[PDB]
Amino acid sequence: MSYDVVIPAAGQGKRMKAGRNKLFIELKGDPVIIHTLRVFDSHRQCDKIILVINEQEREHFQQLLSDYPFQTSIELVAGGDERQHSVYKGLKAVKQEKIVLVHDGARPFIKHEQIDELIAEAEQTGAAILAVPVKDTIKRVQDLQVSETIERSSLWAVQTPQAFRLSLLMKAHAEAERKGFLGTDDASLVEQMEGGSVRVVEGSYTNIKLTTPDDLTSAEAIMESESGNKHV
Amino acid sequence: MSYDVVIPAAGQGKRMKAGRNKLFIELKGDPVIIHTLRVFDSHRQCDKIILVINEQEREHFQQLLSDYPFQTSIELVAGGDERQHSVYKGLKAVKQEKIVLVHDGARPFIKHEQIDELIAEAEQTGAAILAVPVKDTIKRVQDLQVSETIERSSLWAVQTPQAFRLSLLMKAHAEAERKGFLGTDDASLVEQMEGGSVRVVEGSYTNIKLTTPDDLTSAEAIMESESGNKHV
């Protein structure tokens, strides 16, 4: 069906002084967050965007959003420094049982076709995530000494959005909060529940999270190239 | 101090028809492999480059190497299709006990400083690899269903070069081959030996492996940017 999207500003790279959020860095003249918002704004099935921010940057986000036209409702919600608490505070803003997406503010390259595929999986089974196969060797390391190599065959690097039935994800967040469980992503909270199962939709290697100057460099090139002929 | 480097052509992108190897793709006008070779050619401590190729591409690599002048000995060794066995064939070409590096031909962005740190660690303790911390959530997946989230805190994504005392790496490759053990990197073969141990040198996120057209897009941007200013 249609969905609400919760976009945390938290957990999107290192914490910057108020007003110098990494989400405000311009990419081809527009802040990273504007790029990301546009994807959901232009998507027919997105009913509402819930942008969860630090209260000390409310004036900045308000000003920024007043400078661009949107055709989708955007709610600014004050959240914590922790991505997980912020996401849960956003979820609490969702007004009815529906499919909800949680999407990193610093992932502007998500495509509508991946969003539709996700939503279809989540309707069906309750929880779906975008991910890509791991290509590098992964090791666990303690004080720069290798402990083990993680068997690679079935490893996937997880992205966002992540799509869920609202009630299922609210429950996951409630239980994790009660237990003091911190997960790195939303799916991990659902995986900790008794019933919990999470489906995977394969995404694109260009759905990068922008947290460093080097990521911005790659981002500029992805945008420049998206215009054109695509090599396979 | 001084070293030989073994560069497998194998495992550096999907199989292409003879003569159309992914290593031959021009990046800013020069094949990817030429960029990689230049790093070692220009590094004072590199004694020899052992380039392990498919025999069906001998003529192309010969022609490539006639077209570019180098100030470092380069030996073409016919290897197999598998990276691990190819690397072992190259190691068998190293003439005496010394530090040896094994480096992906599709990783052109390695810097001399990082090579120097690797060598120093390998001289010290036997085995060292370049790696960077994992930033994404990593999950194991079966039939597109999540099985588990891999605990993230100590996970590193491994790159090359990987540096070793020759004797140690040869023993590791011999032991692995003797029992049919297949590892995804060289370090994994040392880790599989009784009492084998591997140290990590933290690298750079720009040391990407170029296997797809999207990778080439990123590579162009890294090259364009590395003449310039850089944010921390």
Side-chain angles (χ1 to χ4, degrees):
Chain A
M1 195 22 185
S2 65
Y3 62 97
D4 286 358
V5 59
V6 176
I7 302 182
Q12 304 304 304
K14 76 180 171 186
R15 176 141 209 242
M16 304 298 290
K17 63 217 302 185
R20 275 36 74 99
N21 203 300
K22 283 178 174 304
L23 291 168
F24 304 148
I25 298 165
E26 288 182 4
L27 168 63
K28 293 284 138 38
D30 295 319
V32 165
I33 191 61
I34 296 292
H35 295 287
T36 305
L37 289 167
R38 285 181 181 143
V39 180
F40 295 100
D41 186 49
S42 62
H43 197 214
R44 182 167 305 282
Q45 294 71 35
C46 183
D47 296 338
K48 184 167 87 167
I49 301 160
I50 292 157
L51 182 60
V52 186
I53 57 158
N54 186 284
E55 182 64 51
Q56 301 159 58
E57 291 181 322
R58 194 187 284 280
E59 185 83 353
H60 305 82
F61 275 95
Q62 280 188 284
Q63 179 55 237
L64 179 58
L65 300 173
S66 79
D67 286 351
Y68 289 85
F70 291 103
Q71 63 165 8
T72 312
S73 161
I74 302 169
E75 185 164 357
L76 293 179
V77 170
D81 296 300
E82 292 270 287
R83 189 190 183 273
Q84 183 173 322
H85 177 76
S86 285
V87 167
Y88 190 19
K89 180 73 175 315
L91 291 173
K92 286 167 185 193
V94 183
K95 282 184 272 258
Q96 51 162 22
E97 173 74 333
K98 63 192 307 180
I99 297 294
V100 60
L101 274 57
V102 187
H103 187 65
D104 286 332
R107 286 181 193 272
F109 301 119
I110 176 63
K111 300 310 181 231
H112 292 169
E113 291 73 17
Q114 285 125 53
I115 298 169
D116 299 340
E117 254 211 275
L118 272 170
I119 291 158
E121 286 296 333
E123 285 172 289
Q124 286 248 291
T125 63
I129 61 182
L130 281 170
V132 293
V134 167
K135 299 174 88 57
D136 279 342
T137 295
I138 304 300
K139 300 178 190 292
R140 188 167 306 288
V141 179
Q142 188 182 82
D143 303 316
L144 301 176
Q145 195 94 354
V146 172
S147 293
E148 40 166 342
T149 292
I150 307 305
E151 198 282 323
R152 212 168 40 70
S153 64
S154 41
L155 295 180
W156 293 64
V158 177
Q159 307 177 335
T160 73
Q162 307 194 349
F164 310 82
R165 298 175 194 149
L166 180 65
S167 60
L168 181 67
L169 183 62
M170 294 286 285
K171 195 152 171 279
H173 271 267
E175 294 181 14
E177 182 188 72
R178 188 185 55 71
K179 299 192 271 190
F181 183 85
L182 289 165
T184 57
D185 76 345
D186 291 290
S188 62
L189 311 187
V190 164
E191 291 155 34
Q192 291 296 120
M193 292 197 300
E194 198 215 344
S197 78
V198 175
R199 300 221 78 256
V200 172
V201 174
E202 178 169 8
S204 157
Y205 294 94
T206 62
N207 188 28
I208 61 164
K209 184 175 174 189
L210 311 176
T211 73
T212 70
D214 291 335
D215 301 325
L216 295 168
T217 295
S218 300
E220 292 151 46
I222 289 167
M223 292 198 63
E224 287 161 11
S225 155
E226 262 178 3
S227 318
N229 309 337
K230 86 171 69 229
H231 282 262
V232 160
Chain B
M1 185 202 64
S2 91
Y3 64 100
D4 289 357
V5 62
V6 169
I7 299 176
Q12 303 304 307
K14 68 169 189 195
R15 175 78 51 212
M16 300 302 284
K17 58 218 300 185
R20 284 65 170 210
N21 199 300
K22 292 222 172 277
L23 295 172
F24 304 146
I25 295 161
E26 282 181 8
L27 160 62
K28 285 285 134 51
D30 294 315
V32 167
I33 185 66
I34 293 297
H35 292 285
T36 304
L37 288 170
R38 282 169 182 157
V39 181
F40 295 98
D41 178 53
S42 74
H43 196 214
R44 181 179 143 72
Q45 290 66 32
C46 182
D47 293 332
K48 187 167 90 183
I49 302 158
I50 291 151
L51 184 62
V52 186
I53 63 154
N54 191 290
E55 186 62 57
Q56 298 134 235
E57 294 185 315
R58 196 179 272 290
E59 204 77 356
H60 311 86
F61 280 92
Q62 287 184 278
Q63 180 57 239
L64 192 55
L65 300 176
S66 60
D67 295 340
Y68 294 88
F70 289 113
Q71 63 158 8
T72 311
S73 170
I74 297 175
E75 183 175 8
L76 299 181
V77 172
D81 283 319
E82 289 308 327
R83 196 185 144 285
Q84 173 168 335
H85 175 74
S86 288
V87 167
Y88 196 18
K89 178 65 184 306
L91 293 174
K92 290 176 182 184
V94 179
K95 278 303 237 300
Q96 67 189 287
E97 171 70 340
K98 60 196 305 183
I99 294 305
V100 66
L101 273 58
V102 182
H103 183 67
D104 288 333
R107 284 184 197 273
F109 299 120
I110 179 69
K111 302 290 178 271
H112 291 173
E113 291 83 8
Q114 306 167 304
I115 295 163
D116 296 339
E117 296 174 80
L118 284 161
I119 292 161
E121 186 68 80
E123 288 178 303
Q124 286 277 288
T125 60
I129 67 194
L130 273 187
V132 291
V134 169
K135 296 176 95 157
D136 278 343
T137 293
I138 304 303
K139 299 181 192 295
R140 190 171 308 290
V141 176
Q142 316 300 341
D143 296 320
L144 299 175
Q145 201 93 3
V146 169
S147 315
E148 80 199 295
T149 290
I150 311 300
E151 202 278 315
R152 198 172 71 188
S153 67
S154 42
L155 294 181
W156 292 65
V158 179
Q159 318 176 329
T160 75
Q162 305 196 348
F164 308 83
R165 296 168 185 154
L166 181 68
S167 55
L168 181 61
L169 184 59
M170 293 279 292
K171 191 172 190 251
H173 272 268
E175 286 191 15
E177 192 177 278
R178 185 180 166 186
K179 67 188 159 183
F181 180 81
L182 298 178
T184 58
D185 73 344
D186 293 293
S188 65
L189 309 189
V190 173
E191 294 156 37
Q192 200 65 17
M193 295 195 288
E194 298 298 278
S197 66
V198 179
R199 282 207 50 97
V200 172
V201 173
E202 179 172 0
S204 161
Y205 293 90
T206 57
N207 187 27
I208 56 162
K209 187 170 168 194
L210 308 184
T211 75
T212 66
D214 288 331
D215 300 327
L216 287 164
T217 292
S218 282
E220 292 162 7
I222 291 168
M223 287 201 70
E224 287 159 10
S225 170
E226 76 189 334
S227 62
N229 311 335
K230 59 203 214 172
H231 300 78
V232 44

